[PDB]
Amino acid sequence: ESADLRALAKHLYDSYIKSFPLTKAKARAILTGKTTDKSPFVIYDMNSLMMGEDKIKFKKEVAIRIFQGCQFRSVEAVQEITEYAKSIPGFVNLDLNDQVTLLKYGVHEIIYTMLASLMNKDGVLISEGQGFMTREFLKSLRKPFGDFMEPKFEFAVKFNALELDDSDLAIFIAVIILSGDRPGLLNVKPIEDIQDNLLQALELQLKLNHPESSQLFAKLLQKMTDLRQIVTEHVQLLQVIKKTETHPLLQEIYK
């Protein structure tokens, strides 16, 4: 029933709002919108970073400090996604090991997805949107550290061309979470059952919310390939970094 699908869609939207502080709506307004109330601090070079470190406080080489800050934010994002996942109908009733498996393999795909919401072609909103770090400044960090954000920007530019909103993304990230092809899964059936229902909800959502955008559903699904490729090359970029940035309690938090 369309009624049940639209019910599922609104439920996911409501939970997404409750779980993620900085939404796309709020981030687009900050980046370029009729919001001129407050203004992010711009970080475009080394001096502005130092300047940004004193005013806004972050709760040793510059390129390393930035890397570690990304790790801290990554860890915060995991917990927000984890909370969101619990609201997806059926999710908590899955085998406990499968829940952990889906989250483990899914978080990065979602992190890169939602990061696009905070990006344009020229930079990324940082620290709850109190800041703005430029694409150029990130490009110039060093020999290993100057490459990890560029692929994310490249994906975002393309992904953002789809012009999805929060209500669209809520269902999309749920589809991502309930993938039955994650390795080590024990009971693939109810996962695929839920994803099929989420997929139906996403399709109707896109058809109602973007009636003039032909085949948007298909094109969104095709992006999942871009995401998986980006996750894979990221872990690959981290293995090389591990052989440069060669605290024991900190390395536990960031395993």
Residues binding ligand UNT (CB under 6 A): 58, 66-67, 69-71, 73-74, 111, 115, 124, 126-127, 133, 138, 148-149, 234, 250
Query: Is 71 one of the annotated binding-site residues?
Result: yes
Residue 214 within binding range of a copy of itself, rule CB under 8 A: yes
111/40 Cα distance (integer angstroms) = 21
Binding span for a copy of itself by CB under 8 A among 26-34, 43-51, 86-94, 199-207 = 199-207
DSSP 146-159: TSSSHHHHHHHHHH
Residue 182 tokens, joined:
């994650």
Instruction: Kindly tell me which of 187 and 232 has the beta carbon lying closer to ligand UNT.
Output: 232
- Residue 222 interacts with a copy of itself (CB under 8 A): yes or no: yes
Closer by beta carbon to a copy of itself, 11 or else 228 = 228
Q: State the Cα–Cα distance between residues 97 and 83, nearest whole angstrom.
A: 16
Q: Which residues of 134-165 are buried (b: 16+ CB within 10 A; e: fewer)?
A: bbebbeebeebbebbbebbbebbeebbebebb
| Residue 234 is assigned to a ligand binding site | yes
Q: How far from the centroid of its chain's Cα atoms is residue 22's Cα?
A: 11
The minimum distance between CB 147 and ligand UNT, in angstroms, equals 11
Q: Is 254 annotated as a binding residue?
A: yes
Say whether 74 counts as a known binding-site residue. Answer: yes
Q: What is the C-alpha separation between 24 and 28, in angstroms, rounded? A: 6
Question: What strands lie across the sheet with 119-120, from one edge to the other?
Answer: 41-43, 131-134, 123-126, 119-120
- Please choose which of a copy of itself, ligand UNT, none residue 31 contacts, taking the beta carbon within 5 to 8 angstroms, the exact cut-off set by kind: none
Annotated binding residues, written as ranges, equal: 71-74, 108, 234, 254
Annotated binding residues for rosiglitazone, written as ranges, equal: 71-74, 108, 234, 254
